[PDB]
Structure formats: C-alpha cells, structure tokens
Amino acid sequence: PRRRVIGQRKILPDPKFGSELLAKFVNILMVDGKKSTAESIVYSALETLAQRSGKSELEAFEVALENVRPTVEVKSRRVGGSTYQVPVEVRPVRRNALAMRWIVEAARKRGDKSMALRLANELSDAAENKGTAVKKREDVHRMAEANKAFA
Template identity: 30%
Template sequence: MLVKEKNTKIYGSRIKSDPLVKKTINLLMKDGKRSKAEKVLFKSFQALDKDFPGQSINIFYLAIIAVKQDIAIRVKPKPKKRRNKQSFNVYLPRVISPIRGLGLGIRSILKSSKERSHQSFTPLWESLSQELLQASQNKGEVVAKRYSVSKLALSNKRRVHFTIRR
C-alpha cells in the first residue's frame, strides 16, 4: 500500500491523464493488468528521478520524440517462377501518419527494454529507464534501428508511394 500511495503522490492524476503515458501503459500492459504496467512505468520514472531529479517526464518525452518513425518499410517478396525478373525482395518505403509513428516508437522502446531485461536478468522497469535515457540522448539500439530503416528507405526512394498509411 505504501508504494502505491507514494507513486500516486509523485505521479498524480495529471501524469496518468497524459496521452503518451496512457499509450505507453496500454502497450506495456499484458492480459489486462493495468496496475502492474503502471507500477513498471512509474518505477522507471523513479529510477530516472534518482539520477536526474525532476526530469523524468522530460526524458520520457525526448525519448519518444527521438524514436518516432516517419517512414516504414514494407517488404514485397520476390516473385515466384518468373524468368530473372527481380529475383530479390523489394523494399517499399511508405510514409506513415504521425500517430502511428509515435506508436511504433513506443513499441520499439518497450521491445528493446524487454530484450535487455531478459539478457541481463534485470527488472523490466530498470531496463526501461536505461532505454529511455539512451533514447533521449539519441543513442542506443532503438535510435540505431530507426536510422537504419530511414537509410534503407532512402536507398529505395525510387519506389516511394506517397500515400499516408494509417
């Protein structure tokens, strides 16, 4: 009970009502366990507050903006049984909507933090706070992945279809 009261005092209803925090909690949630997802996110905010007092929300926003994706890649498989006509996979870059880009960025942060916690046997909230900190500094695995996707899209820009994907 004390931990929950402490979290609600520090991170009140103003932060819980924030749209990006809500989206992150919803993507972090498994099997409808919202309270567990909130605890994980707020513990990661507390870990960021220990190193950078009062800056956890700013670090969170900087990380989300740094990993927001503008372009997605769709892989068109190679054709079957045609005579030497594109015997390789074709990458089709697509412009995506900003809301979808934010969702993809949040998902990539959560995925890399889960992988990090499985590899190093650290709690999820600790790896999430480390991933948010690295992403806010434009470093880390997630930002590198974003740059590699945009580089791949740039190399295949002659195939760009200018439709916004929702």
C-alpha cells in the first residue's frame, strides 16, 4: 500500500443464518481452502452452544467475543529509530478479527480427541469470561499497559 491501501476481499454472509461474522469467522477456522470441512465445525459448536450454555448461541457467538474483543493494542514501532512498544487502539473490525483468531487458536490446543468438541468448549469457556481467548485479551490488556514509557 506504499501507494494506496488495497482492501481485503469483501466477504458475503453465511446462508444458514444470513449472518457474516460467521462467514468471516469460518474463513478463519478454514484450513487448506476447504469450506465444507470448516462450516461443519462451527455448527458442531454453535449448535452445542445453544444447549450446553443456554439458548441463543448466536448471542453466545459473541458473549465470548465480547469477552475477547480486544480494546488496547500494541503496534510496536521504531518512530525514533528505536522500537517503541506503544499501546494503541484498533478500529472495531480488527478486534473482532483479532478475537476470532484469538479463539480458533484455543480450539487447536485442547485435544479432547476431536476438533469439533474443542471449538464448542472454548467458545462457552470464554462465553463465561474465562479461559484463553479472553486471557490473550487479558495479557495484551496487561503488557499494553505495562509498557507506557512514551507516546
């Protein structure tokens, strides 16, 4: 973008609910460009969400995200020729994106003998404001504050 920022491909919504955050979300969980393998695992989570954690999974969909959607961010930059780890805000879209990465990663670190089960759990886990995605929101919300020497 040294000339002009090139926009990331603009996405379209899941049909199962007409929503898109799913769409962007599944696009995250997707591995080796296989859409069919990915969407299966979200329904193996959101469906089991609407029951394990209570109805309205699509609202549980984000109660975790809410628990994870970051606010403070650290774009370390050598403004003076020396790298400064300055805490900074990010527009809404990113923190959503970031969070989405922040959870899917946690669905790859739990074992449980299945990937579908891991996504279901971590979602609810962070849906109760407890776990890792929220944690990796905590720590970033911790080291961002810890380094505030200069703007």
